[PDB]
Design a protein around this ligand. Sequence first.
Ligand SMILES: Cc1cc2nc3c(=O)[nH]c(=O)nc-3n(C[C@H](O)[C@H](O)[C@H](O)COP(=O)(O)OP(=O)(O)OC[C@H]3O[C@@H](n4cnc5c(N)ncnc54)[C@H](O)[C@@H]3O)c2cc1C
Ligand code: SF4
Ligand code: SF4
Ligand code: SF4
Ligand code: SF4
Ligand code: SF4
Ligand code: SF4
Ligand code: FES
Ligand code: FES
Lengths: 118, 1178, 118
Amino acid sequence: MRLVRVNIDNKEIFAEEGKTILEVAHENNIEIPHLCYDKRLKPYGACGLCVVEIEGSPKLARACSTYVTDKMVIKTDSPRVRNARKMALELLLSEHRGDCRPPCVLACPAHTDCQGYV
Amino acid sequence: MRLVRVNIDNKEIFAEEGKTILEVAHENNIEIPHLCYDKRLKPYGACGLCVVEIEGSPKLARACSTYVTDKMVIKTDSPRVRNARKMALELLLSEHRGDCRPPCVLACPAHTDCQGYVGLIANGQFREAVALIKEQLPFPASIGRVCPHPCEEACRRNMVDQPIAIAELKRFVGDIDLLDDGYIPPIKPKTGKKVAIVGGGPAGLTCAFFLAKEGHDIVVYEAMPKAGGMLRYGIPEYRLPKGILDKEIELIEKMGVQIKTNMRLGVDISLEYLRKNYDAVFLAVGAWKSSTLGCPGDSAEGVIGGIEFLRKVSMNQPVNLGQRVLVVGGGNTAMDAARTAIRLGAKEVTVLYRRTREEMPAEDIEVNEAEEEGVKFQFLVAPIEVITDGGRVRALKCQRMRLGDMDESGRRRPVPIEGAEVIFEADTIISAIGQKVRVEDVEGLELTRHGTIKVDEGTYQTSLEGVFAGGDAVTGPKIAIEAIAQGKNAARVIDSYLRGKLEPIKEPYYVKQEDLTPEDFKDRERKPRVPLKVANAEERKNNFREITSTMTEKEAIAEASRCLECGCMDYFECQLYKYVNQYDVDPQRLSGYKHKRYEPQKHPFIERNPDKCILCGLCIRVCEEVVGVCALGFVNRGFETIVKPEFGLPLEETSCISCGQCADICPTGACIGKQPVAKQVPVNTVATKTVCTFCGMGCEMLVETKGNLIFDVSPVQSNEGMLCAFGRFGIKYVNDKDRILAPLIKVNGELSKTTFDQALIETAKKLQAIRASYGKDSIAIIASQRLTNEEALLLTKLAQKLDTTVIGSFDLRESVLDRIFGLNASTNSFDEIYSTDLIVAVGKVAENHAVMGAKLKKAVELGAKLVTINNGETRADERAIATYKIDNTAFFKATIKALFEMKAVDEDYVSKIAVNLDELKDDVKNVEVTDEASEFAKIIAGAKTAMVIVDEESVSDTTIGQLANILTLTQKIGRPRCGIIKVTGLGNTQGAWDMGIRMSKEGIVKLINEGKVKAAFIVSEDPQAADKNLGEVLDKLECLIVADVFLTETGKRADVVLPLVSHVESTGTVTRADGKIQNLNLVLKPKNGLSNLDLLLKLAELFGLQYNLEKLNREMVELLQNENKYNQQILYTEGFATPDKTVHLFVSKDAPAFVEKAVFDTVKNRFEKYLQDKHLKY
Amino acid sequence: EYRLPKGILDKEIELIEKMGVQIKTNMRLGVDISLEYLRKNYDAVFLAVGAWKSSTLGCPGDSAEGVIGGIEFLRKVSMNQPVNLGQRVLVVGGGNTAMDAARTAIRLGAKEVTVLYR
Ligand SMILES: Cc1cc2nc3c(=O)[nH]c(=O)nc-3n(C[C@H](O)[C@H](O)[C@H](O)COP(=O)(O)OP(=O)(O)OC[C@H]3O[C@@H](n4cnc5c(N)ncnc54)[C@H](O)[C@@H]3O)c2cc1C
Ligand code: SF4
Ligand code: SF4
Ligand code: SF4
Ligand code: SF4
Ligand code: SF4
Ligand code: SF4
Ligand code: FES
Ligand code: FES
């Protein structure tokens, strides 16, 4: 078929027209964070973790809803993108209540999974 | 994406919009025939084989050009489609002239690849010849000793002088194999099935062989003390020694076949037990009951059957042979009995035959040998009575007869003559008029009218279910190769039955040439056949020693070289043969006028046969669309259409660059690439992927080998799927007979062969003596840039241990990119070429690297803009928007000045990223801006992205510096699709530079001429051949150590010569011109047992260095990481490699833009000289 | 090497190793291993260290650059290590070491080798 040419993280990729940046990067083993995406569902654009830097666009684009076009240059780990993802994650952690690990595991110097084996 | 839904052959498929039916079916493993299709080319629609039935379309649609739409229903094997494909194939076969298989193979009952193993013998591949014989015949030596060889009667060399000694060559290779451990084919994993063969003769042992090849558990039941059948008990020792038979039966037993001798069916074991405890039963009991004289008195004391007598003699059991022996019959049994009786001391042996001499069933050579040994013959007589005196034979009353009229035979029936009767005195009569299947062997089975087992043809199954039969038990007495053919076919059918899918044997369709007559071979040189050594009759008639001798290796090769190679060279890859065998074609109905336009050609690499052309156009389309040379075309029109080079000229005289793409794309052997071997032979090869080492493009290839010889090279299907003349045809040096395999050291002033240890010790001592007597940096290590990264790194470590920094290459170009950007490397990758806005190709980019020319053609077709800068014409000028013919660097300087005049240089950014900007402005301020320079500057400034492709083997370093300046000024470096790519002149130029081999020819020669360097260790370079002025420079050296694949002119003046192996015998890593690292995989084991890395590692262990391939690879990866050049498709994305991380702009005086230099690599220089001698281009 | 090739020596040492003897090379006594450890963990200890220290010239200036012991020089040549051997070599002595050093210096490219004996 007709193939678009993209540059994701300094790697030249020949993708197929009609895919999103998330799908193209998944195919080429490039990790882009995402929390509200699902291949069975229409895009939602809520979490804001999949933002990538596209050369020529002043605003970061959601990789889950942006489609790859011909002669595209994409950065997925630039300092702007990392800062945006860190800010989104901090906002998410602000409204979070939980124990990732129980206090018993954290009090063990060797971090033995006390809860797990109990 | 959006997916279309299709139904191809009742299977629902979710495909992608924009694909054709061919691609969708290929992805879903659905086979649609195609002959004129290629993924790199636009559709052509000529062959009409890919037609499919689409529901809703009354007309069949070509799958190669029809696109899949939503809710489509496609049939690819409906009767309409099959009929259309069969008709197209029959039409294609109507034009075809060729031999799919040679007449020798078709005349063999077992269809042994006579041509294949004869050609392998002519190439010295005796083990491969035996392995190829054993695909159809498990007993080469035995059968080659005793075979009437109809293949030689059908041989086409009969039309020239004398047929090939096919049987003798088979005997030769069989004996060679039996010298050492014999060849055993690979055995499939155990299948859990059990087959019982009754009878260890040729047919039973063949069935056991070919069923043990399939993994089944085989038990053979033999009534005799030993296996072998009539090969042991019928054929006498002087014609087939039993040691060879024993060795071959041991070979069969070594495959897991268990032979239970002295186990007769119906006495020791029953058929019903075999049916109960075995999955299949094969019966190969032969015809072991002899025919009686059929006259009164044929039961006296002194009458014996021919095969019973021969079996008694074979077992060394006593025989009451008198002094007057009458052998009745005219077959092989009669001749063997008569000659054995002669050798057993009988004073008179007479052979009585019913018919005439000129129609004897026996071979003429056997009858002639019997006549020489003293056997007498009587013809046209038949026995009517046996005169017995006291119960013992006294004489035989025979009826004289005459050839009366026709018969069921059809030739002539012998009938009695009345009144004529003759009495022959005889102490013994041997009845040898034929053998019949024993009734007791075939108990419980339905037989024919001759007593043989009745089987269904094609399946070999008897009346009983699960019980098969073959051989002399089924067909009656024949020759042994017929029994072997029956056993092999029965093994195939039995394997199918064990899989539960009983299939009869299907005869393939072969294209043949029945119109050939001797005048078609009148131009061939006549060569005598190998003479057959025959023991003297007088001495041989007294003993049971072998009569004939095996030929010698010289005679074997000379005899195999006589073959005319009648079979098609494309048989194992022809798509037309495969398709006409997939569809039941009857091409004799559409048979008429057929062209015969084939003419022999002198081209060393490509052979074209118009008579095998299906006019798919693929060769033309690939030369025009992919290569871009466009050397082929259509000539004439209609039925007269032919494919010809330009103006019908020979391929050498056209613009052809000998890339071989036409021969690689051809479906039906009308365009083939010649094998780099001594004699052409169509063989089934094994392909290994490796990397071409002849330039920096790093094209991958599949080397197809058979044994220790390379037979073909195929490009991989990656990008343009192209190789050039080098990568496709220069691998011929691997098979060269002039390769040195043992080291040479100078004794008595001349180079003589020695051992590796002695040569390496001599090398180490010579280098150490030079270092001692002359000090530091007195030894130069000049290495070829085709070595792997590990070998280059090890050579740098060897220079470190030898206390010398003078390590470089004579092919090494002066470096300027490390002074400007920091690393002497390409900035971007090859893939980005397809996506850049503008391409600037400098130098002979397409000429020196044809695949890069194809890549530029593809990139311009994809939407790029091409600018070519060169001093002469190039093939890339066709699609260039701007073509500049310059001879001086000033053209770039003016360009730079022009770039400043149009305010196209953002000096604010350049001042932060680059230094020497004011010096650059001062340097270019006084130059004159030309119209060409201003137009180039306009093109450069108007492009968003730009990549400069530079041919570093035809471009000076000043040009590269100025192009780097232009790229830096316009901010076209360190970004995707913007940069500079240097296509290096050899395979691992970049890797050699990275590993520390960074000295040029000029520096090394300057050191030698100043007396500072006194010894040279030269690794696979040819300074003496590639240059005439260096012969004086090499005169200043006191010690010369040369490592090379060939003994060259520079190696003939060396003190020590160390052999090197080819790159297909080496494993390692090579760095592409764009910086990518690829793996050199091992295709062939090294021919002297030592790889290049192994030899260098022995020389290193002589110096106290401990390394291996893995340690050197780890060091290489560390080195690349330390330079920030590891796994980086784009360089200087963060900053440049200069100490201040800034661009050091190139300021220098004007210099010539392009250079012409020789190739110092030995192999590439040799191949270039070979191409020049044959007047070829590349 | 021209008087005793080292392949023969290697073969004979391999023969000795094939008899159950284990050879721990690069294990110097007093540096890598101690005598007391040998006494502790072995029933018997045999010392066959040889005489591996050469005799100096015993004259003023015998520590300059260009003076080397005979066996040190021969060990350097045997190990294929660089030796700063000029063009005028003076071998002092008259024993086995003197003759071997003189002939090795001849084979190493020295244009003048002289042997001085008391
Ligand atoms: C005298 C003579 C000379 C020949 N010369 C030539 C020649 O020069 N060139 C040539 O090409 N061919 C020659 N042939 C032909 C060739 O030898 C036979 O065609 C070939 O051996 C056929 O093999 P087969 O397996 O069909 O039968 P055979 O090998 O005859 O029989 C196979 C085995 O079955 C065994 N057997 C029989 N009955 C039983 C039973 N009840 N239970 C168990 N095992 C049993 C037998 O012992 C024998 O070992 C010759 C044959 C003869 C007799
Ligand atoms: S080109 Fe193909 S079909 Fe024609 S003779 Fe050769 S193998 Fe047979
Ligand atoms: S010349 Fe060679 S290929 Fe042709 S029939 Fe004879 S053996 Fe076969
Ligand atoms: S087995 Fe006989 S017929 Fe077959 S190739 Fe060999 S010699 Fe020819
Ligand atoms: S070898 Fe290459 S250039 Fe020559 S005709 Fe064939 S495809 Fe064209
Ligand atoms: S020679 Fe060319 S046109 Fe003819 S079959 Fe081969 S590829 Fe097709
Ligand atoms: S272009 Fe270079 S790498 Fe490719 S096949 Fe030709 S010589 Fe080999
Ligand atoms: S995955 Fe959540 S915004 Fe894209
Ligand atoms: S017509 Fe489609 S492959 Fe030939």
